[PDB]
Amino acid sequence: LHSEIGRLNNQSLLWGPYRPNIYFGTRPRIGKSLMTGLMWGKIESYTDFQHTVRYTCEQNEGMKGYGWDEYDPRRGGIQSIHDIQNGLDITTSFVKIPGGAHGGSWAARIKGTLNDDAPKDQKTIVVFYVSQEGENSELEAVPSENEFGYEGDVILKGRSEALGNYKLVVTKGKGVIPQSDHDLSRLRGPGQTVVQSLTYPDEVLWQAKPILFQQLKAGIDWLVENKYDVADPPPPWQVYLLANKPGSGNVHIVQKVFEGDFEFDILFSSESAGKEVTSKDLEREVKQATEVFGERFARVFDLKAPFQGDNYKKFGKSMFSNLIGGIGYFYGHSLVDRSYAPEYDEENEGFWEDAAEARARHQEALEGPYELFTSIPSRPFFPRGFLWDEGFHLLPIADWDIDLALEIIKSWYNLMDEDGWIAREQILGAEARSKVPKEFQTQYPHYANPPTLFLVLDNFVERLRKLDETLSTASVDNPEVGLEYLRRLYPLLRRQFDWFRKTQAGDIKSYDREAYSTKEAYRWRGRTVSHCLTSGLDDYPRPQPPHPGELHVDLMSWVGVMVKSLISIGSLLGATEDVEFYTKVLDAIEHNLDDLHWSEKEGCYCDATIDEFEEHKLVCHKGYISLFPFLTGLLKPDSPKLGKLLALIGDESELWSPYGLRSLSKKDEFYGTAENYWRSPVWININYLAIVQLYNIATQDGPYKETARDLYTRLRKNIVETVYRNWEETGFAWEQYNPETGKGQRTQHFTGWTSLVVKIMSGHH
Ligand SMILES: COCCc1ccc(CCCCCN2C[C@H](O)[C@@H](O)[C@H](O)[C@H]2CO)cc1
Incomplete structure (x- = not known):
C-alpha cells in the first residue's frame, strides 16, 4: 500500500507547468x-x-x-x-x-x-x-x-x-x-x-x-x-x-x-x-478546477478575524497560489568544489584569506545529473531551490496537500551525498546556470543552511499522531504509509544531524571555556569579514573579526530543532538506542545555550568569540539572532529567560516596529548600516516563527500567557496588514519590509516565504 500510493502520486504529479523561470511552459517530472x-x-x-x-x-x-x-x-x-x-x-x-x-x-x-x-x-x-x-x-x-x-x-x-x-x-x-x-x-x-x-x-x-x-x-x-x-x-x-x-x-x-x-x-x-x-474538455476541466480550488481554500485557509473579509480572501488566494505555483522541476549537473581543501577547515585566525586562496585554485567541476522538484523564492530573480527557504515554503503547502510536501522533501533528501551534505542552492542544468554568474555557481560541501525542513516534518508528525482529494492526504489517513515514509527518510535525517556535528562544530576544549557539556558548541562554516551567508541572515552583525573561536547561537538552536524531531520520529520507529542518545544531546544543548550564549547583562542570547586575550567574550547584537532559542521552540514556557525575551520583542525602542519585528535593534550600532539586508528590515519568515511561538505560549497555563497573547494578537495584525497593504498598492509580495515606512523593498515576486502570511491569517496553529 506504500508502493501503491507512491505510484499514484507519481502518476498524479508527473505533468505540470513546471518551468517557473519562464512566464508559461510545461515539462513533466522527467529529466530528458x-x-x-x-x-x-x-x-x-x-x-x-x-x-x-x-x-x-x-x-x-x-x-x-x-x-x-x-x-x-x-x-x-x-x-x-x-x-x-x-x-x-x-x-x-x-x-x-x-x-x-x-x-x-x-x-x-x-x-x-x-x-x-x-x-x-x-x-x-x-x-x-x-x-x-x-x-x-x-x-x-x-x-x-x-x-x-x-x-x-x-x-x-x-x-x-x-x-x-x-x-x-x-x-x-x-x-x-x-x-x-x-x-x-x-x-x-x-x-x-x-x-x-x-x-x-x-x-x-x-x-x-x-x-x-x-x-x-x-x-x-x-x-x-x-x-x-x-x-x-x-x-x-x-x-x-x-x-x-x-x-x-x-x-x-x-x-x-x-x-x-x-x-x-x-x-x-x-x-x-x-x-x-x-x-x-479544456473549458469544462478549467471550471471544475476552480470550484475545487475554491472549496479547498475555504477549508484549508479559513482566515480568522480580523481577516475574514473578502479583500483578505483575495489576498490570501494570491499569496498562496503564487507560492505553490512556483513549483518547478529542474534537471542536470551542478558546480561543486570536491577538493575538500584543508583551508576550508577554517581552523586559523584569518581563515577567510586562506579559503579565498583555495577557491582561487578553481577545482570545482560539474557533477550529476541531479533532479529536484521544489518551490522557489523568486520567478524573476532566483527561480531555484534554496534549502532553508523550502522549510518555509512547505509550511502552507503541507496544509494544502501534505503528500505534495512529502514529495518535495523526499526530492530534496535524494540530493544528499554520502557525507550528509545538501548544497544550500540548487543550480541544476545549463538552463538554470544561464541565470547565475559563473562566479556564484559553485557549491561547497562545508556550507550548511538552517535545517528548516525539519519544521515541516515536525508538523507532519503531529498530524500523524492525531481521488485528488484522497491522494493529497493519503500519507496521514493511512498510518502505515506515513510511518514507512519516515522509516525510509529517518536514516538521512540522522545522517544530516551527524553531518552538522561533524562539519559545523565549535571549539570548547581548546580555550578557557567551561560549560555543562564539552560536546555542544556550533559555528557556521563559510563566514567572511562582513557576511555569514550559510546562516540565512546574510549581513546580520557577527563577532569581529570572525574567528575559529566563534560560537553562533542560531546554529545551536537549529541543532536543537533537529534533535527534537529525531526524538519524535525515532520514537515512532522505536530506535531506542538512538532516542537515548538524542535525549542526552538535547539536555546538553539546553544547558549549553545558557552557559555559552546567555547574557545576564543584556537579557538575551548572544553569539560568542574569544578575546584578544584568548578568553570567551559574549557579543550582543539585539535582533533576530538574539531570540533564536525562543524562535525555534527550545525554551520552557515558565523560563525567566523567555519572559526577558518577551520584553525585548515587545519593546518598540529595540525591535518592535508598527510593521513587524525589526531584524536588528534601532539601538544596535550596526542598525541600518552597510547593505542593510538583515540589519533593520522586517522579514516575514522570522516574524512567522515569532508569531507561532507567541501563540504557543498564549494557549497554555503559565506566567507569560497573557503578555504573549497580547503580542501574538498585535504582531499577527502588524505582519498581515503590512504585507497586505503592500499587495494592494503594488500587486507584489516583497522580500522584506521597511521598518520605518512599512514599504516593501528589495525583490518583488517573492513567493517566497512572504506567502507564510496565508498561514498567519488562518491561525489555530
Ligand atoms: C534587480 O534584482 C537583483 C537581482 C539578484 C538576484 C539574485 C541574487 C543572488 C541570490 C539571492 C538570495 C536571496 N536570498 C537571500 C536571503 O538572505 C536568504 O536567507 C535566502 O536563502 C535567499 C533566497 O531566498 C542577487 C541579486
Missing part, C-alpha cells in the same frame, strides 16, 4: 523529455520585436505584474500577466486530465486582450515552442493541406519510452489574422499560422530565444538575397513570419500573428488514455 514554452511580442517596426518579445521572467517598468490566481499542481490553474510594454493582458489556463498509463493529458488556453492604451490594430507575434530530448524518441508536425501554412490546427505526433505515444495540438484560435498584399505573399502566403521543425543537439534545446532568432534572421537574410528591399518592403509582421517547413525534429516552432485580441488552445493527448482531449 518533452517541454513547451510560450513567447509573445508586439511588432510595430523592423527592429522592435527583438526587444518586445517575452519569454523568461523579469520584473521591470515594462511589466505591471503577473502570477497565478489559482493553482493546484494536481489539477492546474489560471495565470494572469499584465504587460505594459506589449499593451497586453494575458491569461494562461492550464489543466490536467488523468487517464492512460503515462501521467495523463493536459490542455492550456492562451488568451491575450489588448489593454486600453494599446493600438486597436496592434500586431502581436505569438510563438509556441516545443522541444524533445532523448535518443529514442520522435516528434513530427503533420503537414497542412494549404501551400504556405495552416488554415486550422497544427498537429504534432510524438513518441518516447517515457510518454509512450502522444499528440500535441495547437488549435487555430480566435483572432483577426493580418493579410499582406505584398509581392512576397506569392511566395510566403498572405499570412497564416506556420511551423518550423528543426534538430539541434539535445543539450541546447532549452535555448528557445536564440534558436528562434536564428530562424527569423535566416528568413530576413533570404528576403535580402531574393531582392526584397526598402524600395518596397513587406510589412514588419510579415518580415518576421517564418517560412513554413513542418516535418520531424526535436524542435518545433509554431507561430501565429494576431491583429487585435486573440486566443488559442494547446491540447496534449496521451494516446494510452481515453479519447483525445478537445477544447470543450
Whole structure:
C-alpha cells in the first residue's frame, strides 16, 4: 500500500507547468523529455520585436505584474500577466486530465486582450515552442493541406519510452489574422499560422530565444538575397513570419500573428488514455478546477478575524497560489568544489584569506545529473531551490496537500551525498546556470543552511499522531504509509544531524571555556569579514573579526530543532538506542545555550568569540539572532529567560516596529548600516516563527500567557496588514519590509516565504 500510493502520486504529479523561470511552459517530472514554452511580442517596426518579445521572467517598468490566481499542481490553474510594454493582458489556463498509463493529458488556453492604451490594430507575434530530448524518441508536425501554412490546427505526433505515444495540438484560435498584399505573399502566403521543425543537439534545446532568432534572421537574410528591399518592403509582421517547413525534429516552432485580441488552445493527448482531449474538455476541466480550488481554500485557509473579509480572501488566494505555483522541476549537473581543501577547515585566525586562496585554485567541476522538484523564492530573480527557504515554503503547502510536501522533501533528501551534505542552492542544468554568474555557481560541501525542513516534518508528525482529494492526504489517513515514509527518510535525517556535528562544530576544549557539556558548541562554516551567508541572515552583525573561536547561537538552536524531531520520529520507529542518545544531546544543548550564549547583562542570547586575550567574550547584537532559542521552540514556557525575551520583542525602542519585528535593534550600532539586508528590515519568515511561538505560549497555563497573547494578537495584525497593504498598492509580495515606512523593498515576486502570511491569517496553529 506504500508502493501503491507512491505510484499514484507519481502518476498524479508527473505533468505540470513546471518551468517557473519562464512566464508559461510545461515539462513533466522527467529529466530528458518533452517541454513547451510560450513567447509573445508586439511588432510595430523592423527592429522592435527583438526587444518586445517575452519569454523568461523579469520584473521591470515594462511589466505591471503577473502570477497565478489559482493553482493546484494536481489539477492546474489560471495565470494572469499584465504587460505594459506589449499593451497586453494575458491569461494562461492550464489543466490536467488523468487517464492512460503515462501521467495523463493536459490542455492550456492562451488568451491575450489588448489593454486600453494599446493600438486597436496592434500586431502581436505569438510563438509556441516545443522541444524533445532523448535518443529514442520522435516528434513530427503533420503537414497542412494549404501551400504556405495552416488554415486550422497544427498537429504534432510524438513518441518516447517515457510518454509512450502522444499528440500535441495547437488549435487555430480566435483572432483577426493580418493579410499582406505584398509581392512576397506569392511566395510566403498572405499570412497564416506556420511551423518550423528543426534538430539541434539535445543539450541546447532549452535555448528557445536564440534558436528562434536564428530562424527569423535566416528568413530576413533570404528576403535580402531574393531582392526584397526598402524600395518596397513587406510589412514588419510579415518580415518576421517564418517560412513554413513542418516535418520531424526535436524542435518545433509554431507561430501565429494576431491583429487585435486573440486566443488559442494547446491540447496534449496521451494516446494510452481515453479519447483525445478537445477544447470543450479544456473549458469544462478549467471550471471544475476552480470550484475545487475554491472549496479547498475555504477549508484549508479559513482566515480568522480580523481577516475574514473578502479583500483578505483575495489576498490570501494570491499569496498562496503564487507560492505553490512556483513549483518547478529542474534537471542536470551542478558546480561543486570536491577538493575538500584543508583551508576550508577554517581552523586559523584569518581563515577567510586562506579559503579565498583555495577557491582561487578553481577545482570545482560539474557533477550529476541531479533532479529536484521544489518551490522557489523568486520567478524573476532566483527561480531555484534554496534549502532553508523550502522549510518555509512547505509550511502552507503541507496544509494544502501534505503528500505534495512529502514529495518535495523526499526530492530534496535524494540530493544528499554520502557525507550528509545538501548544497544550500540548487543550480541544476545549463538552463538554470544561464541565470547565475559563473562566479556564484559553485557549491561547497562545508556550507550548511538552517535545517528548516525539519519544521515541516515536525508538523507532519503531529498530524500523524492525531481521488485528488484522497491522494493529497493519503500519507496521514493511512498510518502505515506515513510511518514507512519516515522509516525510509529517518536514516538521512540522522545522517544530516551527524553531518552538522561533524562539519559545523565549535571549539570548547581548546580555550578557557567551561560549560555543562564539552560536546555542544556550533559555528557556521563559510563566514567572511562582513557576511555569514550559510546562516540565512546574510549581513546580520557577527563577532569581529570572525574567528575559529566563534560560537553562533542560531546554529545551536537549529541543532536543537533537529534533535527534537529525531526524538519524535525515532520514537515512532522505536530506535531506542538512538532516542537515548538524542535525549542526552538535547539536555546538553539546553544547558549549553545558557552557559555559552546567555547574557545576564543584556537579557538575551548572544553569539560568542574569544578575546584578544584568548578568553570567551559574549557579543550582543539585539535582533533576530538574539531570540533564536525562543524562535525555534527550545525554551520552557515558565523560563525567566523567555519572559526577558518577551520584553525585548515587545519593546518598540529595540525591535518592535508598527510593521513587524525589526531584524536588528534601532539601538544596535550596526542598525541600518552597510547593505542593510538583515540589519533593520522586517522579514516575514522570522516574524512567522515569532508569531507561532507567541501563540504557543498564549494557549497554555503559565506566567507569560497573557503578555504573549497580547503580542501574538498585535504582531499577527502588524505582519498581515503590512504585507497586505503592500499587495494592494503594488500587486507584489516583497522580500522584506521597511521598518520605518512599512514599504516593501528589495525583490518583488517573492513567493517566497512572504506567502507564510496565508498561514498567519488562518491561525489555530
Ligand atoms: C534587480 O534584482 C537583483 C537581482 C539578484 C538576484 C539574485 C541574487 C543572488 C541570490 C539571492 C538570495 C536571496 N536570498 C537571500 C536571503 O538572505 C536568504 O536567507 C535566502 O536563502 C535567499 C533566497 O531566498 C542577487 C541579486
